[model samples]
Target: QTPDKSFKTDDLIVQKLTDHTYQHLTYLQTQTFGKVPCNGLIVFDGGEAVIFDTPADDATSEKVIRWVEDSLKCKVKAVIATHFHEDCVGGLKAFHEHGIPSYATNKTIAFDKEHKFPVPQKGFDNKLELNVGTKPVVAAFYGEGHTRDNIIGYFPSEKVMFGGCLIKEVDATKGNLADANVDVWPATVANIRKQYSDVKVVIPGHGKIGGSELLDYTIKLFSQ
Candidate 1:
């Protein structure tokens, strides 16, 4: 089902970014900020559409749903959250209503309880994979970095990653100031880089989306 004439205003911003950045995946401006606005990404590959993260409100999500329903002509099989944030998981209510499995880690699961916002109210264990229909999505728990529970999802074949607040391409000097784990962030991001060394493209939870440049930027920030 499509969102009832609602979608985040932040996702639909008009800006001139490199065409090479989002060539693999289509960018749906959510009226949300490019830096970060509870927005997510949709990866259309292998004749399937997979989404990452979510927005703070359901308005933008409604529009996103409409776009997905019409363009993909497929179901939202799974939603892999980056971490436990109001903006990241706020639209689980709508996703759940569609009967799609919303997956997250235990840390993220408990994050909701502490913050309490009436999102999905459901959770996934340490690691899981969605191998249904004609698509295969691997949702892994690579541990926390950006937040204490941020999990980065990767599509091995397509080399596309859904990097939540964990890794962003906004600024090379940007570091977590809000509620970040400064000490562990470096190691976590390192492991992420090591795990997905050949990652060709990624949809960061914020800023821009691109190839290994974002990963390299993320690792460089912390390595220094």
Candidate 2:
């Protein structure tokens, strides 16, 4: 489904994906890629919302939070980092400043601590389920791919999976493998695909979104 509504600024873009799902994009400047757009997901219901990842930095994250709380008129329940990368947690401080709790895998928490990045407040072992309004959203670890701590967030009611960096966009090359487990990346994505066979919308860490084919594409890309 196409975005029914869009909000854009020099630093952020928020696009409505489904009735209760939205994709937020922020730019991350890197030595290799220059300005790169990072993707995050927001799922809301009733009067509450859950964010999959923070915007690329605290400033941009503040913009996103204001959009959700003010424009969307929803209380921000939590912000989860799919991994420990800057794209996932760079803006985490903004969420905390707003008193919004943050979550990440135990491994991600540890890694963030080691790197002196903003640490997530809660840590789960394998899977975590939380409620946005009354609907359930999940963050699960299938295995290691882009990063050992990478996880995928799923909004089952909408069949939308925030694949993070673990799932790549179509025709995309293997990216930022400095900490990647290339040999196991395929298996990791395959497990996610197996678990969420009905996921209709797949959002990668960067680039345009697709469907289940993105999962297959990621698996195939790393298999060779």
Candidate 3:
């Protein structure tokens, strides 16, 4: 396991996962799930950065933006949603307020249109290619698990995968089945395994960070 390299703000916890990668957690309270921590990523390189997913609200998200721009000395390039869930896009209002462009899958975009969530300005189908500095970053849809529209963001240069809510942290319960596709969960994760077998760092939508074992753990847990 990568050593716990993290710090906490009043609004969120920021963890340094690699030289150019950080993970942030913003907690959310649900009537059903109580205190659930939502996770996202910030990858900065060559004076620019991209945010994948977001905190749970405007205030916390603003802090994240300021941290990247003011503290890290990087320009925020774009924000992407892994799904249409509140935890993924609740902080989108703050990003929009700062004129940051946002993106989501076509399925997520369509859901936002009907649900009245802050719809992403851009839409992609199966995959979207992005970059940080000269390194390649990819956001891909590996079928569905946590939600039908869920997607995972991968930083191939660093071998880091943002599994979103699809792959849970080791030992985490099968959370919020309301939106999950149970029968498809294992297969979806298997597809993710095939695609990113080289990934060394795995960050889930919640809990601790681990290696590719996180993917294997998720597949086995949901399979049973």
Write candidate 2's Cα lDDT for 1-224 as tens digits: 43255678888889888889999999998888799889999999888999999999988899888888787888999999999989999998899999999999999999999999889999999999999999999999999999989999999999999999998899999988998999999888888888888989999999989999999999999997
lDDT of 3 at 178: 86
TM-score of 3: 0.95
What value does the lDDT take at residue 139 in candidate 2?
95
Q: How much does each candidate deviate from the true structure in C-alpha RMSD?
A: 6.0, 1.7, 2.5
TM-score of every candidate? 0.77, 0.97, 0.95
In model 2, which runs have C-alpha deviations exceeding 4 angstroms?
1-5
In the range 91-171, model 1's lDDT, one tens digit per residue, is 777777767667777678777778885444447776666653444566676656678777777666557677767786847
Off by over 4 Å in 3: 1-6
CA lDDT of each prediction against the hidden true structure: 0.61, 0.92, 0.88
Please rank every candidate by lDDT, starting with the best. 2, 3, 1
RMSD of 1: 6.0
Residue 159, model 3: Cα distance from true site in angstroms: 0.6
Candidate 3 lDDT over residue span 32-139, tens digit each? 779888899988788788999978999999989988887778888889999998888898999999998898999999988888887888999988998777877788
lDDT (C-alpha) at residue 155 in model 2: 97
